[PDB]
């Protein structure tokens, strides 16, 4: 007897060419569809509308990289400088994505949805519940940006989605109202790009556990770029400078007789 | 006083927003550019033309997934079924990409560029050198497809770039001429999709060591999809069936006294 | 000039690396072993001789479980794809988590919670576990049972009780639960994961270090499988189609955009 | 019809279908009860052979010496980066392990490879060996140290060589060859000593481990340290790491306006 080891629903390569949710890639190309549509097929088994496609495109472009200093890029750079090939080097950087690096996108969407359903018109109760049980509000706050120096990417994304699409964004609207409240207590408690993207993705009807995929995929663009960049330079193996390390170590000691 | 630890050329986040090869992502979005343009900027520090961008788009779409049975997808499925979160699960599948899984794109591009430079009008000489020093020509050959049943994705890509763009494609042209020679020897020695993509990328002036990025990035779309699919099904931990394993092990023996 | 990171366990600025203050060459010359270096780098304390003897056995017993489980099979898939050893083992290690290896840590965590919150209320523990967690980690086996006991559990429990002086409240608690659970169903035995998890908790190791023993031990096996496949010149793996349930969409034409 | 099954994979080293897992035919519980150790399980699973007591003592010392080299090197630092990003231990250690390869750890394998080739191709021709290395490789792997020299040798090398020659009967042709090479190279330049990577690489080759298994000792040993660093960072509740900007040479494009799409 032979029972299947796994079950798949999204793709199939047993036919003439691979099929994404029933559609051939070459036919998707010939009829004008794009990367964003293949994302919808493989992650949601649904061809996105044009307005959804334009938003997916912009989220990925905006999320593609944040410079070499952050953990995902720097992990890929460390591996590149150790002479590791591209896929394995990028896998090391991608391993950094989780609760602290990228997690604000998923978490902001998760809790701003919970606020929409459990505190529809009780923002102080939401902030109060967050203050006791979570701490800082995911998606709110910036070290440099403020009300009079807002994030241009948030401005653009909010402007594009409200002026160039007809999409209903309950979570984003809630976050935008929270921004009005939070900026009162402290001026730098703005809606940041992670909260904006996290709320928009929740409003686009993607499964909750797929939301991290947009950050993972986008930052893979940057991590590949950094691997290529380090290989273009013939970079050498990295050792962190000693003065950058607080060696709070035990004093040198003699091993006791066994 | 402090020698820099690393050098980066492709991106910077010290300004108002991240800059990709000098360009702000929000401004790229507002002026109609896409994911494919961000790929060109971060992997080659050059803005693609519209025709180049259309080709990059199609390469990523065609490469996004090849079903759950191949090593990259299956590695991500194994990790998903072990309860591993999406970024780490995809990183395990990505680790499978290398000389045997995905490697044909890079090798085809490398050797067909060498053919354009060392055998400009000497296809028999190129094929002769390949058999001596390499063996089979990467990008040539297919297990099922043949001259009278070619790969529809190759047909499409070659047709699109020939008829819908004015790009000069010496590597692709060389491969298409080689196809005439090899198919004259054996009907199934057609130009395959890996060879087509590898040659086109070289003709787009991407570095040889960047070619793999297109496969790594594209297959990340599918690996994310498979992770989502397995989580939608609540699949269980996988153990390979014993009848699928040839246990060519030592006979059980008693441990000798020490 | 503010430090980027802070470390407390090791230092290589001297003549040789120092593990919790001790030089490795000196540890070697005075008769210490791998288990002692584990204690220094994970707990900044030299183990007692009995602690080292237990650590040694836990690692030996956990080193491998055959090629069919997710960690080894992940390393084998990577080996057959031509990936080098460290990266191939990294793919197998990525499989270790709540379902593959996690029972060791969870058994330790919940049997500690039972010892402190239900010292003489096993039904309250079993009831609370069934309500809030589900199956008891470390209990149950698909093949082993009262009729087919586990030799490694027999050995480990026997070694602890007859060859050491260690007090093992967590392991003792699990052994009492085993008496209750096996009465319901013969296969609800204390398994090897539960045995090791309880012992590690009883040795006063930090709770978040417990997974290290499984991670380290199975790295031995994953390296072995990588070597084994490379000795055989194995080829790239593709899962057989008949092993996959393709519950996919029907082939469809793409709609005009 | 019915499916005709052909095995997907073949294994020779281990089997869990019996009463307990078998490592090259031996039960771990029985290995434990008869006094064997971690080093013996390493020998079984990587080489399908029970080590002798002296081979086991050498394996033990190699692993202990290789367990960690501080937090600044790439493997440890990768595990630290992932720990400070909140990643769980197995995945964090996997990120540091990904750094191990031709540049980080590779000197052990390269030293073993080329000093065995010297034993087989230049048995009594050290100058010929050095000449070939300069032409085809460059510096001799396992020779040289930036700080240590003949006046300040590596104590771990001294200890390992002393232990093997005074506390065991092992024949170490590769190690012996390297020790003679050291005499020639140190005459050229005082810091061209035999370093710990060359010592371990040669000893492992002399233990009859396959060349492609040599990296296993570094991978396994440094997993001990990488686990330790993950635990250490979690004990401290360290924060997400961002490399300071002044540590980065931003040789980037100037800020530019995006051209209109044509
Ligand atoms: C030796 O190869 P054979 O035993 O002939 O095997 P095979 O049938 O696969 O090869 C037939 C021909 O196609 C060639 N060939 C086979 N596969 C490929 C390939 N992937 N790329 C290019 N040429 C190929 C072989 O070199 C041979 O040509 P030759 O007679 O000029 O040397
Ligand atoms: C740099 O400072 P210099 O004093 O010029 O040293 P340099 O790098 O030129 O090497 C000096 C000598 O040591 C040798 N050498 C340098 N590094 C190594 C090494 N890692 N292993 C072996 N020999 C080495 C060189 O080959 C040269 O010897 P040679 O003249 O016989 O070829
Ligand atoms: Na930056
Ligand atoms: Na709205
Ligand atoms: Na053709
Ligand atoms: Na098995
Ligand atoms: Na390899
Ligand atoms: Na290797
Ligand atoms: Na057996
Ligand atoms: Na853990």
PDB file of N, CA and C in Angstrom, chain D residues 101-186:
ATOM      1  N   UNK D 101      33.018  27.291   6.346  1.00  0.00           N
ATOM      2  CA  UNK D 101      33.304  26.944   4.979  1.00  0.00           C
ATOM      3  C   UNK D 101      34.741  27.218   4.619  1.00  0.00           C
ATOM      4  N   UNK D 102      34.980  27.639   3.383  1.00  0.00           N
ATOM      5  CA  UNK D 102      36.376  27.740   2.909  1.00  0.00           C
ATOM      6  C   UNK D 102      37.218  28.745   3.679  1.00  0.00           C
ATOM      7  N   UNK D 103      36.615  29.782   4.260  1.00  0.00           N
ATOM      8  CA  UNK D 103      37.390  30.800   4.961  1.00  0.00           C
ATOM      9  C   UNK D 103      37.320  30.675   6.474  1.00  0.00           C
ATOM     10  N   UNK D 104      36.217  30.194   7.011  1.00  0.00           N
ATOM     11  CA  UNK D 104      36.011  30.095   8.455  1.00  0.00           C
ATOM     12  C   UNK D 104      35.968  28.608   8.757  1.00  0.00           C
ATOM     13  N   UNK D 105      37.087  28.081   9.289  1.00  0.00           N
ATOM     14  CA  UNK D 105      37.246  26.660   9.506  1.00  0.00           C
ATOM     15  C   UNK D 105      37.985  25.932   8.397  1.00  0.00           C
ATOM     16  N   UNK D 106      38.054  26.511   7.195  1.00  0.00           N
ATOM     17  CA  UNK D 106      38.613  25.795   6.060  1.00  0.00           C
ATOM     18  C   UNK D 106      40.077  25.431   6.180  1.00  0.00           C
ATOM     19  N   UNK D 107      40.835  26.135   7.031  1.00  0.00           N
ATOM     20  CA  UNK D 107      42.265  25.879   7.144  1.00  0.00           C
ATOM     21  C   UNK D 107      42.555  24.483   7.675  1.00  0.00           C
ATOM     22  N   UNK D 108      41.661  23.941   8.503  1.00  0.00           N
ATOM     23  CA  UNK D 108      41.840  22.580   9.008  1.00  0.00           C
ATOM     24  C   UNK D 108      41.818  21.584   7.853  1.00  0.00           C
ATOM     25  N   UNK D 109      40.776  21.645   7.028  1.00  0.00           N
ATOM     26  CA  UNK D 109      40.664  20.745   5.886  1.00  0.00           C
ATOM     27  C   UNK D 109      41.801  20.961   4.888  1.00  0.00           C
ATOM     28  N   UNK D 110      42.131  22.221   4.585  1.00  0.00           N
ATOM     29  CA  UNK D 110      43.183  22.473   3.595  1.00  0.00           C
ATOM     30  C   UNK D 110      44.537  21.988   4.096  1.00  0.00           C
ATOM     31  N   UNK D 111      44.842  22.208   5.381  1.00  0.00           N
ATOM     32  CA  UNK D 111      46.098  21.699   5.936  1.00  0.00           C
ATOM     33  C   UNK D 111      46.177  20.178   5.829  1.00  0.00           C
ATOM     34  N   UNK D 112      45.098  19.487   6.192  1.00  0.00           N
ATOM     35  CA  UNK D 112      45.100  18.041   6.083  1.00  0.00           C
ATOM     36  C   UNK D 112      45.279  17.573   4.654  1.00  0.00           C
ATOM     37  N   UNK D 113      44.612  18.247   3.710  1.00  0.00           N
ATOM     38  CA  UNK D 113      44.689  17.850   2.311  1.00  0.00           C
ATOM     39  C   UNK D 113      46.106  18.002   1.760  1.00  0.00           C
ATOM     40  N   UNK D 114      46.741  19.152   2.008  1.00  0.00           N
ATOM     41  CA  UNK D 114      48.019  19.433   1.358  1.00  0.00           C
ATOM     42  C   UNK D 114      49.195  18.783   2.072  1.00  0.00           C
ATOM     43  N   UNK D 115      49.108  18.581   3.387  1.00  0.00           N
ATOM     44  CA  UNK D 115      50.185  17.883   4.075  1.00  0.00           C
ATOM     45  C   UNK D 115      50.144  16.381   3.828  1.00  0.00           C
ATOM     46  N   UNK D 116      48.971  15.813   3.550  1.00  0.00           N
ATOM     47  CA  UNK D 116      48.947  14.428   3.092  1.00  0.00           C
ATOM     48  C   UNK D 116      49.505  14.330   1.676  1.00  0.00           C
ATOM     49  N   UNK D 117      49.125  15.269   0.802  1.00  0.00           N
ATOM     50  CA  UNK D 117      49.694  15.293  -0.540  1.00  0.00           C
ATOM     51  C   UNK D 117      51.212  15.449  -0.485  1.00  0.00           C
ATOM     52  N   UNK D 118      51.726  16.175   0.513  1.00  0.00           N
ATOM     53  CA  UNK D 118      53.169  16.277   0.682  1.00  0.00           C
ATOM     54  C   UNK D 118      53.765  14.941   1.104  1.00  0.00           C
ATOM     55  N   UNK D 119      53.066  14.206   1.974  1.00  0.00           N
ATOM     56  CA  UNK D 119      53.570  12.907   2.421  1.00  0.00           C
ATOM     57  C   UNK D 119      53.617  11.918   1.267  1.00  0.00           C
ATOM     58  N   UNK D 120      52.692  12.031   0.314  1.00  0.00           N
ATOM     59  CA  UNK D 120      52.617  11.076  -0.785  1.00  0.00           C
ATOM     60  C   UNK D 120      53.395  11.515  -2.019  1.00  0.00           C
ATOM     61  N   UNK D 121      53.517  12.823  -2.254  1.00  0.00           N
ATOM     62  CA  UNK D 121      54.183  13.337  -3.440  1.00  0.00           C
ATOM     63  C   UNK D 121      55.549  13.939  -3.157  1.00  0.00           C
ATOM     64  N   UNK D 122      55.846  14.282  -1.909  1.00  0.00           N
ATOM     65  CA  UNK D 122      57.154  14.817  -1.549  1.00  0.00           C
ATOM     66  C   UNK D 122      57.655  14.182  -0.258  1.00  0.00           C
ATOM     67  N   UNK D 123      57.703  12.847  -0.173  1.00  0.00           N
ATOM     68  CA  UNK D 123      58.054  12.210   1.110  1.00  0.00           C
ATOM     69  C   UNK D 123      59.319  12.755   1.759  1.00  0.00           C
ATOM     70  N   UNK D 124      60.373  12.988   0.984  1.00  0.00           N
ATOM     71  CA  UNK D 124      61.629  13.519   1.500  1.00  0.00           C
ATOM     72  C   UNK D 124      62.099  14.700   0.661  1.00  0.00           C
ATOM     73  N   UNK D 125      61.152  15.528   0.197  1.00  0.00           N
ATOM     74  CA  UNK D 125      61.449  16.685  -0.642  1.00  0.00           C
ATOM     75  C   UNK D 125      60.620  17.882  -0.151  1.00  0.00           C
ATOM     76  N   UNK D 126      60.929  18.349   1.062  1.00  0.00           N
ATOM     77  CA  UNK D 126      60.237  19.519   1.601  1.00  0.00           C
ATOM     78  C   UNK D 126      60.407  20.725   0.690  1.00  0.00           C
ATOM     79  N   UNK D 127      61.601  21.034   0.164  1.00  0.00           N
ATOM     80  CA  UNK D 127      61.713  22.192  -0.744  1.00  0.00           C
ATOM     81  C   UNK D 127      60.839  22.080  -1.983  1.00  0.00           C
ATOM     82  N   UNK D 128      60.724  20.884  -2.565  1.00  0.00           N
ATOM     83  CA  UNK D 128      59.825  20.711  -3.694  1.00  0.00           C
ATOM     84  C   UNK D 128      58.373  20.969  -3.324  1.00  0.00           C
ATOM     85  N   UNK D 129      57.965  20.528  -2.136  1.00  0.00           N
ATOM     86  CA  UNK D 129      56.601  20.781  -1.686  1.00  0.00           C
ATOM     87  C   UNK D 129      56.352  22.279  -1.551  1.00  0.00           C
ATOM     88  N   UNK D 130      57.249  22.983  -0.856  1.00  0.00           N
ATOM     89  CA  UNK D 130      57.086  24.423  -0.683  1.00  0.00           C
ATOM     90  C   UNK D 130      57.064  25.141  -2.026  1.00  0.00           C
ATOM     91  N   UNK D 131      57.859  24.670  -2.986  1.00  0.00           N
ATOM     92  CA  UNK D 131      57.885  25.297  -4.303  1.00  0.00           C
ATOM     93  C   UNK D 131      56.553  25.124  -5.024  1.00  0.00           C
ATOM     94  N   UNK D 132      55.992  23.912  -4.994  1.00  0.00           N
ATOM     95  CA  UNK D 132      54.700  23.693  -5.632  1.00  0.00           C
ATOM     96  C   UNK D 132      53.605  24.522  -4.966  1.00  0.00           C
ATOM     97  N   UNK D 133      53.634  24.628  -3.636  1.00  0.00           N
ATOM     98  CA  UNK D 133      52.610  25.396  -2.938  1.00  0.00           C
ATOM     99  C   UNK D 133      52.651  26.864  -3.347  1.00  0.00           C
ATOM    100  N   UNK D 134      53.853  27.440  -3.457  1.00  0.00           N
ATOM    101  CA  UNK D 134      53.959  28.844  -3.827  1.00  0.00           C
ATOM    102  C   UNK D 134      53.392  29.092  -5.218  1.00  0.00           C
ATOM    103  N   UNK D 135      53.521  28.116  -6.119  1.00  0.00           N
ATOM    104  CA  UNK D 135      53.050  28.283  -7.487  1.00  0.00           C
ATOM    105  C   UNK D 135      51.537  28.127  -7.595  1.00  0.00           C
ATOM    106  N   UNK D 136      50.968  27.118  -6.925  1.00  0.00           N
ATOM    107  CA  UNK D 136      49.580  26.730  -7.147  1.00  0.00           C
ATOM    108  C   UNK D 136      48.629  27.110  -6.024  1.00  0.00           C
ATOM    109  N   UNK D 137      49.139  27.453  -4.842  1.00  0.00           N
ATOM    110  CA  UNK D 137      48.277  27.754  -3.709  1.00  0.00           C
ATOM    111  C   UNK D 137      48.653  29.109  -3.125  1.00  0.00           C
ATOM    112  N   UNK D 138      49.942  29.319  -2.884  1.00  0.00           N
ATOM    113  CA  UNK D 138      50.388  30.508  -2.201  1.00  0.00           C
ATOM    114  C   UNK D 138      50.887  30.136  -0.822  1.00  0.00           C
ATOM    115  N   UNK D 139      50.389  30.810   0.217  1.00  0.00           N
ATOM    116  CA  UNK D 139      50.781  30.421   1.575  1.00  0.00           C
ATOM    117  C   UNK D 139      50.369  28.983   1.858  1.00  0.00           C
ATOM    118  N   UNK D 140      51.172  28.306   2.670  1.00  0.00           N
ATOM    119  CA  UNK D 140      50.897  26.923   3.047  1.00  0.00           C
ATOM    120  C   UNK D 140      49.835  26.919   4.142  1.00  0.00           C
ATOM    121  N   UNK D 141      48.660  26.324   3.913  1.00  0.00           N
ATOM    122  CA  UNK D 141      47.656  26.247   4.987  1.00  0.00           C
ATOM    123  C   UNK D 141      48.181  25.485   6.194  1.00  0.00           C
ATOM    124  N   UNK D 142      47.890  26.013   7.382  1.00  0.00           N
ATOM    125  CA  UNK D 142      48.394  25.436   8.611  1.00  0.00           C
ATOM    126  C   UNK D 142      49.734  25.973   9.061  1.00  0.00           C
ATOM    127  N   UNK D 143      50.390  26.798   8.244  1.00  0.00           N
ATOM    128  CA  UNK D 143      51.654  27.432   8.593  1.00  0.00           C
ATOM    129  C   UNK D 143      51.417  28.936   8.691  1.00  0.00           C
ATOM    130  N   UNK D 144      51.921  29.546   9.748  1.00  0.00           N
ATOM    131  CA  UNK D 144      51.861  30.987   9.893  1.00  0.00           C
ATOM    132  C   UNK D 144      50.912  31.441  10.984  1.00  0.00           C
ATOM    133  N   UNK D 145      51.293  32.518  11.661  1.00  0.00           N
ATOM    134  CA  UNK D 145      50.454  33.142  12.674  1.00  0.00           C
ATOM    135  C   UNK D 145      50.836  34.615  12.744  1.00  0.00           C
ATOM    136  N   UNK D 146      49.831  35.482  12.855  1.00  0.00           N
ATOM    137  CA  UNK D 146      50.089  36.918  12.831  1.00  0.00           C
ATOM    138  C   UNK D 146      50.713  37.431  14.120  1.00  0.00           C
ATOM    139  N   UNK D 147      50.533  36.732  15.244  1.00  0.00           N
ATOM    140  CA  UNK D 147      51.020  37.194  16.536  1.00  0.00           C
ATOM    141  C   UNK D 147      52.040  36.236  17.137  1.00  0.00           C
ATOM    142  N   UNK D 148      51.779  34.937  17.066  1.00  0.00           N
ATOM    143  CA  UNK D 148      52.668  33.933  17.630  1.00  0.00           C
ATOM    144  C   UNK D 148      53.841  33.654  16.692  1.00  0.00           C
ATOM    145  N   UNK D 149      54.933  33.170  17.276  1.00  0.00           N
ATOM    146  CA  UNK D 149      56.166  32.923  16.533  1.00  0.00           C
ATOM    147  C   UNK D 149      56.981  31.864  17.270  1.00  0.00           C
ATOM    148  N   UNK D 150      58.199  31.609  16.781  1.00  0.00           N
ATOM    149  CA  UNK D 150      59.068  30.626  17.419  1.00  0.00           C
ATOM    150  C   UNK D 150      59.362  31.022  18.859  1.00  0.00           C
ATOM    151  N   UNK D 151      59.392  32.323  19.143  1.00  0.00           N
ATOM    152  CA  UNK D 151      59.611  32.797  20.501  1.00  0.00           C
ATOM    153  C   UNK D 151      58.339  32.800  21.335  1.00  0.00           C
ATOM    154  N   UNK D 152      57.169  32.754  20.698  1.00  0.00           N
ATOM    155  CA  UNK D 152      55.882  32.787  21.398  1.00  0.00           C
ATOM    156  C   UNK D 152      54.944  31.788  20.733  1.00  0.00           C
ATOM    157  N   UNK D 153      55.236  30.494  20.854  1.00  0.00           N
ATOM    158  CA  UNK D 153      54.469  29.486  20.108  1.00  0.00           C
ATOM    159  C   UNK D 153      53.072  29.302  20.683  1.00  0.00           C
ATOM    160  N   UNK D 154      52.236  28.617  19.915  1.00  0.00           N
ATOM    161  CA  UNK D 154      50.873  28.341  20.339  1.00  0.00           C
ATOM    162  C   UNK D 154      50.916  27.190  21.339  1.00  0.00           C
ATOM    163  N   UNK D 155      50.458  27.448  22.568  1.00  0.00           N
ATOM    164  CA  UNK D 155      50.514  26.426  23.610  1.00  0.00           C
ATOM    165  C   UNK D 155      49.633  25.231  23.270  1.00  0.00           C
ATOM    166  N   UNK D 156      48.553  25.446  22.514  1.00  0.00           N
ATOM    167  CA  UNK D 156      47.686  24.334  22.154  1.00  0.00           C
ATOM    168  C   UNK D 156      48.390  23.390  21.188  1.00  0.00           C
ATOM    169  N   UNK D 157      49.203  23.938  20.279  1.00  0.00           N
ATOM    170  CA  UNK D 157      50.000  23.107  19.385  1.00  0.00           C
ATOM    171  C   UNK D 157      51.039  22.332  20.181  1.00  0.00           C
ATOM    172  N   UNK D 158      51.769  23.022  21.063  1.00  0.00           N
ATOM    173  CA  UNK D 158      52.717  22.348  21.939  1.00  0.00           C
ATOM    174  C   UNK D 158      52.044  21.220  22.711  1.00  0.00           C
ATOM    175  N   UNK D 159      50.880  21.494  23.304  1.00  0.00           N
ATOM    176  CA  UNK D 159      50.216  20.472  24.103  1.00  0.00           C
ATOM    177  C   UNK D 159      49.817  19.272  23.242  1.00  0.00           C
ATOM    178  N   UNK D 160      49.167  19.528  22.103  1.00  0.00           N
ATOM    179  CA  UNK D 160      48.686  18.440  21.256  1.00  0.00           C
ATOM    180  C   UNK D 160      49.838  17.574  20.758  1.00  0.00           C
ATOM    181  N   UNK D 161      50.914  18.206  20.269  1.00  0.00           N
ATOM    182  CA  UNK D 161      52.056  17.434  19.788  1.00  0.00           C
ATOM    183  C   UNK D 161      52.673  16.640  20.929  1.00  0.00           C
ATOM    184  N   UNK D 162      52.806  17.266  22.101  1.00  0.00           N
ATOM    185  CA  UNK D 162      53.389  16.571  23.242  1.00  0.00           C
ATOM    186  C   UNK D 162      52.518  15.392  23.674  1.00  0.00           C
ATOM    187  N   UNK D 163      51.206  15.598  23.749  1.00  0.00           N
ATOM    188  CA  UNK D 163      50.323  14.522  24.186  1.00  0.00           C
ATOM    189  C   UNK D 163      50.411  13.330  23.242  1.00  0.00           C
ATOM    190  N   UNK D 164      50.385  13.587  21.933  1.00  0.00           N
ATOM    191  CA  UNK D 164      50.396  12.493  20.970  1.00  0.00           C
ATOM    192  C   UNK D 164      51.688  11.702  21.074  1.00  0.00           C
ATOM    193  N   UNK D 165      52.822  12.402  21.164  1.00  0.00           N
ATOM    194  CA  UNK D 165      54.111  11.722  21.123  1.00  0.00           C
ATOM    195  C   UNK D 165      54.479  11.099  22.456  1.00  0.00           C
ATOM    196  N   UNK D 166      53.999  11.649  23.572  1.00  0.00           N
ATOM    197  CA  UNK D 166      54.381  11.131  24.882  1.00  0.00           C
ATOM    198  C   UNK D 166      53.303  10.290  25.550  1.00  0.00           C
ATOM    199  N   UNK D 167      52.032  10.484  25.202  1.00  0.00           N
ATOM    200  CA  UNK D 167      50.941   9.789  25.869  1.00  0.00           C
ATOM    201  C   UNK D 167      50.223   8.788  24.977  1.00  0.00           C
ATOM    202  N   UNK D 168      50.616   8.666  23.712  1.00  0.00           N
ATOM    203  CA  UNK D 168      50.021   7.683  22.817  1.00  0.00           C
ATOM    204  C   UNK D 168      51.113   7.046  21.966  1.00  0.00           C
ATOM    205  N   UNK D 169      50.730   5.980  21.263  1.00  0.00           N
ATOM    206  CA  UNK D 169      51.600   5.295  20.319  1.00  0.00           C
ATOM    207  C   UNK D 169      51.229   5.586  18.873  1.00  0.00           C
ATOM    208  N   UNK D 170      50.375   6.570  18.629  1.00  0.00           N
ATOM    209  CA  UNK D 170      49.914   6.842  17.274  1.00  0.00           C
ATOM    210  C   UNK D 170      51.079   7.244  16.376  1.00  0.00           C
ATOM    211  N   UNK D 171      51.083   6.698  15.164  1.00  0.00           N
ATOM    212  CA  UNK D 171      51.994   7.115  14.107  1.00  0.00           C
ATOM    213  C   UNK D 171      51.329   8.254  13.345  1.00  0.00           C
ATOM    214  N   UNK D 172      52.008   9.400  13.261  1.00  0.00           N
ATOM    215  CA  UNK D 172      51.425  10.623  12.700  1.00  0.00           C
ATOM    216  C   UNK D 172      52.314  11.142  11.577  1.00  0.00           C
ATOM    217  N   UNK D 173      52.315  10.466  10.423  1.00  0.00           N
ATOM    218  CA  UNK D 173      53.156  10.942   9.306  1.00  0.00           C
ATOM    219  C   UNK D 173      52.839  12.363   8.861  1.00  0.00           C
ATOM    220  N   UNK D 174      51.560  12.728   8.748  1.00  0.00           N
ATOM    221  CA  UNK D 174      51.226  14.081   8.314  1.00  0.00           C
ATOM    222  C   UNK D 174      51.717  15.106   9.330  1.00  0.00           C
ATOM    223  N   UNK D 175      51.459  14.860  10.616  1.00  0.00           N
ATOM    224  CA  UNK D 175      51.932  15.776  11.648  1.00  0.00           C
ATOM    225  C   UNK D 175      53.449  15.865  11.642  1.00  0.00           C
ATOM    226  N   UNK D 176      54.133  14.724  11.484  1.00  0.00           N
ATOM    227  CA  UNK D 176      55.588  14.734  11.431  1.00  0.00           C
ATOM    228  C   UNK D 176      56.086  15.569  10.261  1.00  0.00           C
ATOM    229  N   UNK D 177      55.452  15.427   9.095  1.00  0.00           N
ATOM    230  CA  UNK D 177      55.860  16.218   7.938  1.00  0.00           C
ATOM    231  C   UNK D 177      55.701  17.710   8.218  1.00  0.00           C
ATOM    232  N   UNK D 178      54.564  18.100   8.803  1.00  0.00           N
ATOM    233  CA  UNK D 178      54.334  19.506   9.098  1.00  0.00           C
ATOM    234  C   UNK D 178      55.366  20.037  10.083  1.00  0.00           C
ATOM    235  N   UNK D 179      55.744  19.225  11.072  1.00  0.00           N
ATOM    236  CA  UNK D 179      56.733  19.666  12.050  1.00  0.00           C
ATOM    237  C   UNK D 179      58.098  19.889  11.407  1.00  0.00           C
ATOM    238  N   UNK D 180      58.445  19.100  10.385  1.00  0.00           N
ATOM    239  CA  UNK D 180      59.676  19.354   9.644  1.00  0.00           C
ATOM    240  C   UNK D 180      59.538  20.592   8.762  1.00  0.00           C
ATOM    241  N   UNK D 181      58.380  20.761   8.115  1.00  0.00           N
ATOM    242  CA  UNK D 181      58.133  21.971   7.338  1.00  0.00           C
ATOM    243  C   UNK D 181      58.264  23.205   8.220  1.00  0.00           C
ATOM    244  N   UNK D 182      57.739  23.136   9.447  1.00  0.00           N
ATOM    245  CA  UNK D 182      57.860  24.255  10.375  1.00  0.00           C
ATOM    246  C   UNK D 182      59.315  24.673  10.565  1.00  0.00           C
ATOM    247  N   UNK D 183      60.223  23.700  10.654  1.00  0.00           N
ATOM    248  CA  UNK D 183      61.638  24.016  10.819  1.00  0.00           C
ATOM    249  C   UNK D 183      62.164  24.838   9.648  1.00  0.00           C
ATOM    250  N   UNK D 184      61.745  24.506   8.427  1.00  0.00           N
ATOM    251  CA  UNK D 184      62.216  25.242   7.257  1.00  0.00           C
ATOM    252  C   UNK D 184      61.559  26.618   7.202  1.00  0.00           C
ATOM    253  N   UNK D 185      60.239  26.666   7.388  1.00  0.00           N
ATOM    254  CA  UNK D 185      59.521  27.926   7.232  1.00  0.00           C
ATOM    255  C   UNK D 185      59.896  28.920   8.327  1.00  0.00           C
ATOM    256  N   UNK D 186      60.044  28.452   9.569  1.00  0.00           N
ATOM    257  CA  UNK D 186      60.433  29.364  10.639  1.00  0.00           C
ATOM    258  C   UNK D 186      61.830  29.933  10.414  1.00  0.00           C
TER     259      UNK D 186
END
